[PDB]
Design a protein around this ligand. Structure first.
Ligand SMILES: Nc1nc2c(ncn2[C@@H]2O[C@H](COP(=O)(O)OP(=O)(O)OP(=O)(O)O)[C@@H](O)[C@H]2O)c(=O)[nH]1
Ligand SMILES: Nc1nc2c(ncn2[C@@H]2O[C@H](COP(=O)(O)OP(=O)(O)O)[C@@H](O)[C@H]2O)c(=O)[nH]1
Ligand SMILES: Nc1nc2c(ncn2[C@@H]2O[C@H](COP(=O)(O)OP(=O)(O)O)[C@@H](O)[C@H]2O)c(=O)[nH]1
Ligand SMILES: [Mg+2]
Ligand SMILES: [Mg+2]
Lengths: 98, 432, 427, 252, 426
């Protein structure tokens, strides 16, 4: 029964791909940037509170003087809801010297 | 480089080792002569400048033809042909024959080999001891081995898969003499003793696998599955890896309790695993059932004290935690008060590999359970009863005492077994 | 240029740093190779409070990743952001504490601490000035807890005046993954209270809910959960890294929160969390952020604020935001439910505001609070540990390793004192 | 209880929202072309560029000839780890150098013989005359030079711990080599003779005097198979004679 | 035009020379043949120091290679850079010493000193201002231990002003290679305590530790060990071969490193020694160069200075930018670690600078240290020698060639003296 059942057993190699399917279900590597991401994808969003307030002189494509009172709701938003994010981020030429 | 050595004693030890090391050469790609990314054969196999992976273990028996069959079977060039140790005369199902005469003449050759295997290893973590618990070689020569490697090697982990004799059916006639005397010596020199039976896996081979006339070869595969599920946290990568000394220090609370009980959950046939949904709830809930447990004993009669759940495959920790929670809130699974956590989780990343044309199938996820229970005192009180009947007859002592062993060693074989039952009853009581 | 040195302890700590040092690298702009391909100058100016400068541009991180097994220390070295940690800042043994506080603190874990202090002294004196240390580990094992508590007692001894952040992963109430869990937890808390200045409690079970009830995934995992843990840690020390309208540090944090030198167990949290189905459906604004800030469902521990009472509460905000709306609304939540806020402190909230949110976020914030809801956490560990210590279970895996019996009963005495310390301000 | 995708049973909607966002991230990155495969399959194809060498009119080797470098088979059995042979020098990006079990020209293995002191494109290369090997990278259109500096504590070989051989774009004396006859009792007399094409020669450095060794017993693993390691060291048998591991063929 | 004649003696010295002459052959840019295929002009400006000149651009090294048996010299001749040495400067006999200082210093050894002294006279007079000779040996053999010291004696007798520098590989603490090494060494220090102006103790054990703990290297070979000795043999004569800001020759280092006469054993150590995978992760700044060149793990000898007290310290720094961070981080050390620096001497560090960087590295440094911890070296050598002379072991060999037992005791004396002489200045 030792010789009969124990066979030299050619051909069949055990599966190694299914290692790495359960590797990635537990790790979740393509999911790591989808966890805390919110609203739309955006590569450039940051700006300082000095550069936009003292150097960039606020948002350019917005209304400079026009302040509408909206037909429905009790608010003058086109200065507030603008949320200035225009132009390049905080950059003044120090990556150039490094 | 985190090798643990496996030592197999007796006909039972070497025969379950053939199934244990078939799979090792199966799972790690090792064609059965020695040659062939991830993983670690260095944990269980060797290397050389020819690509060859020597099975770093030792098989010792007092029967020459079984080892001679290994040297003439399939794994000739695989095993290195002087680390397979054999003798010219068997113990003939006797304790003292394997303890005071046959053991002395062959132990120095065994200890020489395990020296030159420990020297090449830098990360020796522990010992795997595969021995028959009611035989001649596995009762006597194991006892000498445990006496010697527990003293010389200091504090290392020593896990044994003792082949516990079945309660109702038995092969021997002098089994309670061999069984009680070997667990006397190995009580103080072991770390966990995992009992398995032979009738239970015969039942599992019948009701779950739909193949009749089961032999020992179809049995040792499920023993091989359990050892593989235990050791693959070292052979392979996993989410929550569980090393070898976790069972050693995290399953036993007292030095004389170390008798846990093994269960392999997903037993299923080849025509049923394409054909059934493996679910994490269905696999570990059926593992608690008394009907599919590897020693014939009812855990409902006793209380669970510590448990260790080993998961292996496409398994997430949440489905482990959800399923282990619904076990905790179940009334019929009686659980001890003073050990309220009582659980361990181990995760591996592979389906268990399947033997060629066997009675098992390619399950994508498996659960191995190692739980210790005070209900096992019922299994040892039966051998207490069988010792009482056969020693009051003064039966068959002359084979034992006439071979150097003092008759009075039959005595302290029992009062310590009385206290070990007594220690199991006292830990067996609720505290309030 | 105030310097923070980060420490990892064990398999839990290494996986935290594996999921934290990708967040800072993707936020500051560091690639997998270390070269700074940033998008702006306002990430590079304070690249000093983290990754250290090495020639070629390589901004090699400053973190002593430690572990008593050679298992997870490899998972990091071989992954997305693995080739960044100096190939020597990795101190890995081979034995393994094996879920035991004893051999992780006294016998086997005490041989590797000389190899860590040789590394810690090496890279904490090269900085101009050290702001303090920080460490992440789990109380549930023998490596993160055993050697983590020995390392934390050492680095406090030579440097007493430095501030210390420790992010302990406390046990879960319902589902535990270790039978010897209340042994490694209680005797770690004893080593934690006189050797720390501030401690955050992280729960495995409490963060399983958020990825299912708030973020709504059927398969939350450790990788999906350590990002939440790394989110608040990158969310605490932002004013050290970036400017803003009201800037703070780890010490304006520390002084406002913990009133007494023992009551430094806090409530970590992360505000802007919602499912991927409410992606373009939700206005990421202050009334949608501060309302979920104080909810018990958005808490990174097993504590309920509804049964306890806060002592001090705290938040740092990010992004270009006016803050009259976090001065009115943080005052409303201070005033709408005064049953949950302490009476003898007049102002319970602190405020600080940064100017950069994390990448992918437009306006984020994190949560911190000292509460008497850590009381139910510690008494649950206390009731679980005393229920096993009376029957002398698992002591020989704690006694035969060179540890006396006496520090066991001193361990419960110290924690019974601390639960009584939170008893006096319950109401 | 645990049904899969496209079936609306329990948290189906957020699982569906997982599908599109992953899908959209793929499909955006797909038609632009920043997947790993389409970045790597064009790195393979331009390195494994099918082309033909320059056949010699005579049996001799002229300058400017695009030539192969092949190390032949050996009966060497000192270490029984043995890549079966006919090993050819090849490109090795991660740029390093390695052997390969290749006999046909595939572009990453073709080497142009350049002139160090000579000027004419057509003239016979002779033994003991300095020459430089050259290769062009995939879509680089710029010449690389086979070079090897001295052995220090900072720059050396990967698997073996001896002197390495590497590629640079700079020109110096460090990237020039000279040919030698494999018979040391007849090497000095063959100084004025030109080199035959398909014969055993020894390639030695000129600032270092170490030959191009072809270590087989160590295996390097890259995107093209087990490929051994090439380094710079002279190996001498009991009878000071360069060992099989040092010979090379300028097959064309 | 100062020049340094090299004198490699013994197998160990002929293997330390194989590497030194290859290392100094790159620094200056001389290829095996002997020509100059280099780049800068500051490479052939001071070749005179460790290089002569013949037909055309040949630069035959000024080295008299010595070995009792003709096997080690033969290996060199037929090696990578062996056709550079003049075939005549290879002085070898036929029989050896058999690890016997007696033979090397009294028998087969005084029968060769004549021919070796002839060449060291034809390579010294063949030069003007000679900074001094220089020897590379292995106290613990026979040629290197005996002939080495026989030469070191008969060269100070004829040229008694030139600087006798020697790089001796002292017997290791534990690592034992030759069994009769206690004797050879104990009998070869009495000479190196009164016939050298600057001896270096480069134990092989320390070398393995810097190629294991600092320069993570699984398999260290004798070439790596030899490289670490050659690197610290080119830094001490670096301001004589390359332009500098604060120059420092081989005398302007003794003058300010040998406190009182006798004491003259120095513990060498390199500076920019990092691994291969950890080579691009460490910024090579002056701070991160002193930290290692003073750390005990780097000491190229086996006598941790913590156990002692530096009587003097040197630092032949090599590199460009280095004139304020150098001193600020050199007084710092003397200020923090203040118990490992004697008080009877105010300033204890001799700073130097060579504005030419070692090929590859941007900056390097070499620390010659005279700790009173070297008193351990001799102590172990004596504890062992005294253990064998007691039960007169091997004496037969030594006493036979021609040596009274008084000599042996006289030796233990001179040595035990040095240890106490050191102890007092501590
Ligand atoms: N479960 C299981 N039990 C076995 C196996 N082989 C033997 N046994 C049992 O172990 C007991 C001991 O039998 P052996 O192993 O043949 O005896 P031994 O230990 O080799 O000692 P000797 O009889 O002297 O050769 C028998 O009663 C069997 O019931 C096996 O492969 N699986
Ligand atoms: N949050 C979180 N917890 C983890 C992670 N991995 C492990 N843990 C926790 O760590 C505990 C086990 O800790 P253990 O591995 O023994 O720590 P060690 O002793 O340092 O190795 C479990 O109860 C988990 O809750 C992870 O990736 N994230
Ligand atoms: N550091 C170093 N030591 C060496 C080297 N080669 C030999 N040695 C040492 O030199 C000693 C042998 O010197 P030996 O041959 O007996 O000297 P000789 O017999 O008089 O020529 C050995 O103990 C070695 O440790 C080397 O390349 N480097
Ligand atoms: Mg048998
Ligand atoms: Mg001067």
């Amino acid at each position: 029964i030792y010789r009969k059942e124990y066979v030299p057993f050619p051909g069949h190699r055990p599966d190694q791909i299914s290692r790495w399917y359960s590797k990635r279900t537990v790790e979740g590597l393509p999911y790591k940037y989808l966890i805390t991401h919110h609203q739309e994808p955006s590569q450039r969003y940051l700006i300082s509170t000095y550069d936009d307030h003292y150097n960039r002189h606020n948002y350019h494509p917005g209304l400079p003087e026009l302040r509408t009172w909206n037909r429905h709701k009790l608010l003058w938003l086109p200065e507030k809801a603008d949320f200035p994010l225009l132009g390049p981020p905080t950059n003044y030429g120090l990556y150039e010297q490094l | 480089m985190r090798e643990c050595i496996s030592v197999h004693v007796g006909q039972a030890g070497v025969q379950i080792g053939n199934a244990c090391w078939e799979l090792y050469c199966l799972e790690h790609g090792i064609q059965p002569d020695g040659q062939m990314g991830d993983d670690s054969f260095n944990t269980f196999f060797s290397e050389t400048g020819a690509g060859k992976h020597v099975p770093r273990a030792v098989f010792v028996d007092l029967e020459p033809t079984v080892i001679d069959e290994v040297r003439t079977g399939t794994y000739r060039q695989l095993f290195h042909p002087e680390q397979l140790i054999t003798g010219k005369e068997d113990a003939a199902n006797n304790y003292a024959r394997g303890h005071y005469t046959i053991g002395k003449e062959l132990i120095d050759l065994v200890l020489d080999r395990i020296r030159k295997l420990a020297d090449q290893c830098t990360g020796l973590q522990g010992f795997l001891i595969f021995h028959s618990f009611g035989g001649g070689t596995g009762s006597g020569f194991t006892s000498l081995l445990m006496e010697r490697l527990s003293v010389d090697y200091g504090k290392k982990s020593k896990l044994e898969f003792s082949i516990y004799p079945a309660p109702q059916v038995s092969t021997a006639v002098v089994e309670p003499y061999n069984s009680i005397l070997t667990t006397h010596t190995t009580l103080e020199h072991s770390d966990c003793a995992f009992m398995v039976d032979n009738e239970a896996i015969y039942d599992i081979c019948r009701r779950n696998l739909d193949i009749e006339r089961p032999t020992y070869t179809n049995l040792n595969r499920l023993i091989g599955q359990i050892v593989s599920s235990i050791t693959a946290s070292l052979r392979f990568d996993g989410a929550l890896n569980v090393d070898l000394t976790e069972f050693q220090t995290n399953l036993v609370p007292y030095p004389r309790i170390h008798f846990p009980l093994a269960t392999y959950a997903p037993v299923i046939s080849a025509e049923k695993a394409y054909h059934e949904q493996l679910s994490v709830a269905e696999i570990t809930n059926a593992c608690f059932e008394p009907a599919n447990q590897m020693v014939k004993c009812d855990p409902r009669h006793g209380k669970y004290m510590a448990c260790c759940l080993l998961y292996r495959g496409d398994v997430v920790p949440k489905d482990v935690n959800a399923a282990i929670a619904t076990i905790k809130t179940k009334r019929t699974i009686q659980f001890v008060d003073w050990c309220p956590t009582g659980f361990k989780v181990g995760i591996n990343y592979q389906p268990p590999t399947v033997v060629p044309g066997g009675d098992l199938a390619k399950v994508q996820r498996a659960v191995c359970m190692l739980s210790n229970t005070t209900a096992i005192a019922e299994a040892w009180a039966r051998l207490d009863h069988k010792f009482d009947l056969m020693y009051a007859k003064r039966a068959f002592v002359h084979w034992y005492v006439g071979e150097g062993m003092e008759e009075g060693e039959f005595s302290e074989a029992r009062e310590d077994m009385a206290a070990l039952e007594k220690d199991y009853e006292e830990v067996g009581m609720d505290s309030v | 240029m105030r310097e923070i040195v980060h420490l990892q302890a064990g398999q839990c700590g290494n996986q935290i740093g594996a999921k934290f040092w990708e967040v800072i690298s993707d936020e500051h702009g560091i690639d997998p190779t270390g070269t700074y391909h940033g998008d702006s100058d306002l990430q590079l100016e304070r690249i000093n409070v983290y990754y250290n400068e090495a020639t070629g541009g390589k901004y090699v991180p400053r973190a002593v990743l430690v572990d008593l097994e050679p298992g997870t220390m490899d998972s990091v070295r071989s992954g997305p952001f693995g080739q960044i940690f100096r190939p020597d800042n990795f101190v890995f043994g081979q034995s393994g504490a094996g879920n035991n506080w004893a051999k992780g603190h006294y016998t086997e874990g005490a041989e590797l601490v000389d190899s860590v202090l040789d590394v810690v002294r090496k890279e904490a004196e090269s900085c101009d000035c050290l702001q303090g240390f920080q460490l992440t580990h789990s109380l549930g094992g023998g490596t993160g807890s055993g050697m983590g508590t020995l390392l934390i007692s050492k680095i406090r001894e030579e440097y007493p005046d430095r501030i210390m952040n420790t992010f302990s992963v406390v046990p879960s109430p319902k589902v535990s993954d270790t039978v010897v869990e209340p042994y490694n937890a209680t005797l770690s808390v004893h080593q934690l209270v006189e050797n720390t200045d501030e401690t955050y409690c992280i729960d495995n079970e409490a963060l399983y809910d958020i990825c299912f009830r708030t973020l709504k995934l059927t398969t939350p995992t450790y990788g999906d959960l350590n990002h939440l843990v790394s989110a608040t840690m990158s969310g605490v020390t932002t004013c050290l890294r970036f400017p803003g309208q009201l800037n703070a540090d780890l010490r304006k944090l520390a002084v406002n929160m913990v009133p007494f030198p023992r009551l430094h167990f806090f409530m970590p949290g992360f505000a802007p969390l919602t499912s991927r189905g409410s992606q373009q459906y939700r206005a990421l604004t202050v009334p949608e952020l501060t309302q979920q800030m104080f909810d018990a469902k958005n808490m990174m521990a097993a504590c309920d604020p509804r049964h306890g009472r806060y002592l001090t509460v705290a938040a740092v905000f990010r992004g270009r935001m006016s803050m009259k709306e976090v001065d009115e609304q943080m005052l409303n939540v201070q005033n709408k439910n005064s049953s949950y806020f302490v009476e003898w402190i007049p102002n319970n909230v602190k405020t600080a505001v940064c100017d950069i949110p994390p990448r992918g976020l437009k306006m984020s914030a994190t949560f911190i609070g000292n509460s008497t809801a850590i009381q139910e956490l510690f008494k649950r560990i206390s009731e679980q540990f005393t229920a096993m210590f009376r029957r002398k279970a698992f002591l020989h895996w704690y006694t035969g390793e060179g540890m006396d019996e006496m520090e066991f009963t001193e361990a419960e005495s110290n924690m019974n004192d601390l639960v009584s310390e939170y008893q006096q301000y319950q109401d | 209880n645990l049904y899969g995708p496209r079936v609306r049973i329990g948290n189906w909607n957020e699982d569906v929202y997982l599908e599109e966002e992953i899908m959209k991230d793929f499909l955006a990155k797909r038609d632009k072309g920043q997947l790993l495969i389409q970045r790597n399959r064009r790195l393979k194809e331009n390195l494994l560029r099918p082309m033909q060498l320059s056949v010699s009119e005579d049996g001799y080797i002229h300058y400017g000839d695009k030539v192969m470098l092949v190390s032949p088979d050996h009966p060497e059995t000192e270490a029984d780890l043995f890549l079966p042979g006919d090993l050819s020098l090849c490109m090795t990006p991660d740029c390093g150098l390695s052997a390969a079990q290749t006999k046909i020209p595939v572009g990453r293995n073709t080497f142009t013989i350049l002139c160090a002191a000579g000027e004419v494109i057509g003239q016979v290369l002779r033994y003991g005359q300095n020459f430089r090997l050259g290769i062009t990278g995939g879509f680089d259109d710029r010449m690389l030079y086979l070079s090897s500096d001295h052995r220090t504590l900072l720059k050396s070989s990967k698997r073996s711990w001896l002197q390495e051989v590497f590629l640079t774009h700079e020109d110096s004396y460090l990237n020039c080599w000279q040919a030698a006859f494999p018979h040391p009792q007849l090497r000095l007399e063959y100084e004025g003779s030109p080199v035959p094409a398909n014969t055993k020669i020894l390639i030695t450095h000129c600032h270092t005097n170490r030959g191009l060794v072809a270590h087989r017993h160590l295996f390097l693993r890259t995107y093209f198979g087990q490929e051994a390691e090439v380094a710079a060291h002279t190996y001498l048998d009991s009878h000071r004679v360069e060992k099989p591991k040092n010979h090379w063929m300028l097959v064309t």
